[PDB]
Design a protein around this ligand. Structure first.
Ligand SMILES: CC(C)(O)Cn1c(NC(=O)c2ccnc(-c3ccccc3)c2)nc2ccccc21
Length: 301
């Protein structure tokens, strides 16, 4: 070809009869998400799934199918992949179940059991997910802690490709040039990565809390950034500050962020100071659960 390489991803279409809905997991601007089980007809397999549904019209269907295109196209351990779609009256996106929910809600609810090792490992895993999207020439355009999900406390993945593109908006996560000039690059995703880290290191504090969205661009033009979280050493805070430069190229690349956070993750208590960091433990690995298989172990030929 002359331009981008051909996208040879498989869009799998699933029957309504192949999966059960168990309960509702959430409802908001993103849509409505149900817990379910996907049982492929001719296989001794049960797959825990999230089933997304909109909150029916041509506008809704076009926009949700664009998201399905992008999700079906990605394949990385730190990115949520689409398992398939279902063509009932309402188009349903069938995704891998992330049992522990989004990372923002997780850090809020488990603040008193989250250690430096978990926080820094999460930063590494998000950076890998984003670096992969950069390899696929994809700008996420909505990276935040709410859009990172938790498969296990050890394993997180990036989600929500409803604004993802090739190379009411979230003003407080966006780079300055995105707010002013609608310019979006992988480096604008780095700014958002910085804000995402700040969310985690503050245990899910709202950025610029009280300051309205219209004040943000002039605040950033003057040079005011998000403050240093109590637990953050200058080493970690410097990296956030580097993500928030005016010059987009002067910000770090995701590959460098993988490197720096993985160096720090080898000696976590040198880079994050948390009271009682040693004694903390988070969980580690009704229904007939015998033939249950996680989607990550269910690979299509
Ligand atoms: C929105 C909410 C309530 O925080 C999501 N929530 C989930 N969510 C997924 O398992 C999932 C998987 C894959 N993708 C998504 C997606 C995709 C696009 C845009 C938003 C969410 C979502 N699992 C939960 C388990 C317990 C409690 C809450 C859970």
């Amino acid at each position: 070809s002359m331009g981008e390489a051909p996208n040879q991803a498989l869009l799998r279409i699933l029957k309504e009869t192949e999966f059960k809905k168990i309960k509702v997991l959430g409802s908001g601007a993103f849509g409505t998400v149900y817990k379910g089980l996907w049982i492929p007809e001719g296989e001794k397999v049960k797959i825990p799934v999230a089933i997304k549904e909109l909150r029916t019209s041509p506008k809704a269907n076009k926009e949700i199918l664009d998201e399905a295109y992008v999700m079906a196209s990605v394949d990385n351990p730190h990115v949520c992949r689409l398992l398939g779609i279902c063509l009932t009256s309402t188009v349903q996106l069938i995704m891998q179940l992330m049992p522990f929910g989004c990372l923002l809600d997780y850090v809020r609810e488990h603040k008193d059991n989250i250690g430096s090792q978990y926080l820094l490992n999460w930063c590494v895993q998000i950076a890998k997910g984003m670096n992969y999207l950069e390899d696929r020439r994809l700008v996420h355009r909505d990276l935040a802690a709410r859009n990172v999900l938790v498969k296990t406390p050890q394993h997180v993945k990036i989600t929500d490709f409803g604004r993802a593109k090739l190379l009411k908006v979230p003003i407080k996560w966006m780079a300055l040039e995105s707010i002013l000039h609608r310019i979006y690059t992988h480096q604008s995703d780095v700014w958002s990565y910085g804000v995402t880290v700040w969310e985690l290191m503050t245990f899910g504090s709202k950025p610029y809390d009280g300051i309205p969205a219209s004040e943000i661009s002039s605040i950033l033009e003057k040079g005011e950034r998000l403050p240093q979280p109590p637990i953050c050493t200058i080493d970690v805070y410097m990296i956030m500050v580097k993500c928030w430069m005016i010059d987009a190229d002067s910000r770090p690349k995701f590959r460098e962020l993988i490197i720096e956070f993985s160096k720090m993750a080898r000696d976590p208590q040198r880079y994050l100071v948390i009271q009682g960091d040693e004694r903390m433990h988070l969980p580690s690995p009704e229904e007939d659960m015998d033939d249950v298989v996680d989607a990550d172990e269910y690979l299509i030929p």
